[PDB]
Write an enzyme that holds these catalytic residues in place. Structure first.
Site, PDB file in Angstrom:
ATOM      1  N   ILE C  85       0.873  -1.186   0.000  1.00  0.00           N
ATOM      2  CA  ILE C  85       0.000   0.000   0.000  1.00  0.00           C
ATOM      3  C   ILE C  85       0.901   1.224   0.000  1.00  0.00           C
ATOM      4  CG2 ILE C  85      -1.738   1.295   1.300  1.00  0.00           C
ATOM      5  CD1 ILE C  85      -1.496  -2.415   1.917  1.00  0.00           C
ATOM      6  N   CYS C  86       1.101   1.799  -1.178  1.00  0.00           N
ATOM      7  CA  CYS C  86       1.794   3.087  -1.329  1.00  0.00           C
ATOM      8  C   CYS C  86       0.774   4.180  -1.024  1.00  0.00           C
ATOM      9  CB  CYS C  86       2.394   3.214  -2.722  1.00  0.00           C
ATOM     10  SG  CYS C  86       3.036   4.858  -3.118  1.00  0.00           S
ATOM     11  N   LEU C  87       0.510   4.395   0.262  1.00  0.00           N
ATOM     12  CA  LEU C  87      -0.427   5.430   0.732  1.00  0.00           C
ATOM     13  C   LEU C  87       0.280   6.299   1.765  1.00  0.00           C
ATOM     14  CD1 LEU C  87      -3.359   6.485   0.450  1.00  0.00           C
ATOM     15  CD2 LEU C  87      -3.984   4.916   2.290  1.00  0.00           C
TER      16      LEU C  87
END
Ligand SMILES: [Zn+2]
Ligand SMILES: [Zn+2]
Lengths: 476, 126, 153
Positions: C85-87
């Protein structure tokens, strides 16, 4: 399609790679797009192969290099790659940017100029290469005529400065001028553009902007940075007072501005001198309109440096003196009262500064303490152990008193030391008048004694001298 | 005992602010002959919540970092100087949070930084 | 410690009143990690799929962010094959935006939001991102195939 070029590059240059380069003429775009899509190391290998197989001694490779330059320029911003590939591309391009003539790099400069002006540059990382190009232009003695590469650089940078910038991209714009070899007017137009950009900014953005403006001011361009910041924040605080006629945020700004200006003059022992010279009201003695709350706050956050301290604290003193002299002449004369509009005096300036000091202004109080005590010690009653002689002196000590009063009201880490200083100057001297100190002390204690249950022992030990002290003073 | 004990407040820089201001100008009115509670009710010029909810969790009095009450006996005391948040916090959790933060500048024994919930200036004195 | 403080409340909270289309329990295999399940959002190709996720709590967590992964894989631009999760909310300051005012329920709500609205700006999968950018029905088709292949019983 790549492995053939790998095998061509595996042994030798410009004998088979050129020959194959004259086979595949177009489709480098889509080639590099699937390349970055699948694996970027292959793109780097292709770039190495391209720049070895396309030397710029021959002019056909110069155009392949210009096309692929524009390709990487557009994709690196628009096409969201991985980070390491992007860094690699940028490093490679910055490496091979040196092997060009004047006008090809001039048109690359014009590409970036028109792009940052109008082109919605998605990431702006491409600009990292720009100052490399300006360097190659300055150094390349392959003379042009439109003229030297350094002069075409001057032209392009004057074009860029006179042109419009992005709101987001001023940080990186000035970050580029950071590492360039520049001259006086170069750096002057850079800072002037970044200066006028202040009026279209969020306020969380200003601190690092001014940080970079100053580390660039380090080149030669010191005076104008501070003068502009001063005028900016002066008008700002005036406008905010007229609104009162985001205060906490505004304070939080001014503080970190001054912090970074401190590091600056910490690293530059001349910066403060021009700062002083810009500010000193006593050019002959007439009040300048240069000073301000924020100005003064900067000075007092500065005085805690060991060199300028006494210089500043003398300056402020004499300026206050002139303030009161001109003020008493004004109130003494109707004729002049008819002409001049009242001007925010130094005293009131300081008081409002104290009001703002409440939030997080720890660096200021340390000098405020000294300042107040200095006023009192300097001009305290000593003659009886007249208005021209006495009103300034009395107003001065009175102002010191007000300062220390409104300070002691709110600051919980300079008490005991305000306190013991008053006690120290009081006890021992035993000759010169200290009625001022005593009335001060009376007001202090009266307003807020409970704090002094915490600030206790200084008074218990102060009583020890009571057997030696003179009577009347002891009564008071 | 009826003599003035030494005291101070824990809480907000806008709620604790005028409380001490009243106390400063009514301590002289401290009549030690009365009861202490009675003296306070006039000195502070207020009534207490006299066990008004005592020990009944409406989620008001809670750390917001550790979400707990009596963290090692430590009370939610540090609060926001904000009408909209009024989020109270412990000492240790707020300290450790404003430790790593980049904007968190450290004076003598102070840490400045943004309230976690509202991103407004908040001051922590150790 | 404050880890367990956050955890003991968030456990009961996500057990009783979790977000809509989200559930989470103490991972019955781990007992230190957590097992989350995001139900396939409507108006998505991910419908007819209960996407399992592993949630790791670092030891300094209200201060660190969590670390989530999609155990049930997903054909997404911003979620890779592994389930990363590139958040920003799982990232620290100025890089990201984590702070203790957020929590497991908030970040899971953000993930459920992302599952309906892919981010074209921060792609883990650049090719799925270009597909979602230009060729919408092919992306939606491959995502629904991925859902009915793995996420369905
Ligand atoms: Zn806590
Ligand atoms: Zn707050």
């Amino acid at each position: 399609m790549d492995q053939k070029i790998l095998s061509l590059a595996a042994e030798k240059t410009a004998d088979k790679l050129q020959e194959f380069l004259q086979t595949l003429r177009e489709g480098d775009l889509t080639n590099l797009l699937q390349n970055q899509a699948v694996k970027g190391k292959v793109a780097g290998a292709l770039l190495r192969a391209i720049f070895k197989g396309s030397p710029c001694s021959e002019e056909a490779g110069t155009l392949r290099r210009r096309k692929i330059y524009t390709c990487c320029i557009q994709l690196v911003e628009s096409g969201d790659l991985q980070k390491e590939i992007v860094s690699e591309i940028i490093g490679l391009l910055m490496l091979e940017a040196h092997h060009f003539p004047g006008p090809l790099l001039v048109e690359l400069a014009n590409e970036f100029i028109s792009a940052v002006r109008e082109g919605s540059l998605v990431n702006g990382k491409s600009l990292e290469l720009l100052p490399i190009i300006l360097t190659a232009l300055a150094t390349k003695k392959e003379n042009l005529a439109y003229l030297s590469g350094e002069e075409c650089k001057k032209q392009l940078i004057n074009t860029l400065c006179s042109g419009r910038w992005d709101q987001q991209y001023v940080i990186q714009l000035t970050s580029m001028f950071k590492d360039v070899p520049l001259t006086a007017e170069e750096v002057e137009f850079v800072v002037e553009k970044a200066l006028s950009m202040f009026s279209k900014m969020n306020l969380q953005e200003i601190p690092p902007l001014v940080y970079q403006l100053l580390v660039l001011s380090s080149k030669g361009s010191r005076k104008s940075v501070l003068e502009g910041i001063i005028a900016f924040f002066s008008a700002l605080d005036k406008q905010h007072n007229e609104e009162q006629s985001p205060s906490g945020e505004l304070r939080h700004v001014e503080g970190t501005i001054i912090l970074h200006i401190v590091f600056a003059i910490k690293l530059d022992y001349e910066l403060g001198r021009e700062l002083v010279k810009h500010l000193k009201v006593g050019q002959q003695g007439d009040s300048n309109n240069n000073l301000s709350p924020f100005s003064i706050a900067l000075l007092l956050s500065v005085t805690r440096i060991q060199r300028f301290q006494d210089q500043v604290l003398d300056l402020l003193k004499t300026s206050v003196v002139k303030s009161f002299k001109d003020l008493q002449l004004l109130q003494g004369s109707k004729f002049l009262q008819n002409l001049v509009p009242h001007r925010s005096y130094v005293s009131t300036m300081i008081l409002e500064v104290v009001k703002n000091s409440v939030h997080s202004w720890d660096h200021v109080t340390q000098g405020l303490v000294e300042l107040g005590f200095i006023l009192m010690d300097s001009y305290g009653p000593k003659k009886v152990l007249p208005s021209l002689s006495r009103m300034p002196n009395q107003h001065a000590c009175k102002l010191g008193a007000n300062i220390l009063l409104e300070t002691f009201k709110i600051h919980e880490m300079i008490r005991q030391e305000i306190l013991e200083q008053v006690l120290n100057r009081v006890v021992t001297r035993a000759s010169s008048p200290i009625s001022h100190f005593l009335d001060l002390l009376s007001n202090i204690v009266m307003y807020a004694p409970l704090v002094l249950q915490s600030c206790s022992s200084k008074v218990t030990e102060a009583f020890d001298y009571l057997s030696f002290l003179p009577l009347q003073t002891v009564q008071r | 005992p009826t003599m003035l004990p030494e005291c101070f407040f824990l809480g907000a820089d806008h709620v604790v602010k005028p409380l001490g201001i009243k106390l400063s100008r009514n301590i002289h009115l401290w009549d030690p002959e009365n009861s202490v509670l009675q003296n306070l009710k006039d000195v502070l010029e207020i009534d207490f919540p006299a066990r008004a909810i005592l020990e009944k969790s409406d989620f008001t009095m809670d750390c917001g970092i550790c979400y707990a009450y009596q963290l090692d006996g430590t009370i939610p005391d540090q609060v926001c100087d904000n009408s909209q948040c009024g989020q109270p916090f412990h000492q240790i959790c707020l300290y450790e949070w404003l430790r790593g933060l980049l904007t968190s500048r450290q004076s003598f024994n102070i840490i400045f930084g943004e309230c976690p919930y509202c991103s407004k200036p908040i001051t922590l004195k150790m | 410690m404050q880890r367990a403080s956050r955890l003991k409340r968030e456990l009961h909270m996500l057990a009783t009143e979790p977000p809509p289309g989200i559930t989470c329990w103490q991972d019955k295999d781990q007992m230190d990690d957590l097992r989350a399940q995001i139900l396939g959002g409507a108006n998505t190709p991910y419908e007819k799929g209960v996407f399992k996720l592993e949630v790791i709590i670092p030891e300094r967590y209200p201060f660190e962010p969590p670390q989530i992964r999609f155990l049930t894989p997903i054909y997404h631009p911003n979620i890779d094959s592994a389930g990363r999760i590139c958040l920003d909310v799982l990232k620290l300051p100025p890089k990201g935006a984590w702070r203790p005012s957020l929590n497991i329920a908030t970040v899971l709500t953000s993930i459920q939001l992302l599952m309906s609205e892919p981010n074209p700006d921060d792609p883990l999968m650049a090719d799925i991102s270009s597909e979602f950018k230009y060729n919408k029905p092919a992306f939606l088709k491959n995502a629904r195939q991925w859902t009915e292949k793995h996420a369905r019983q």
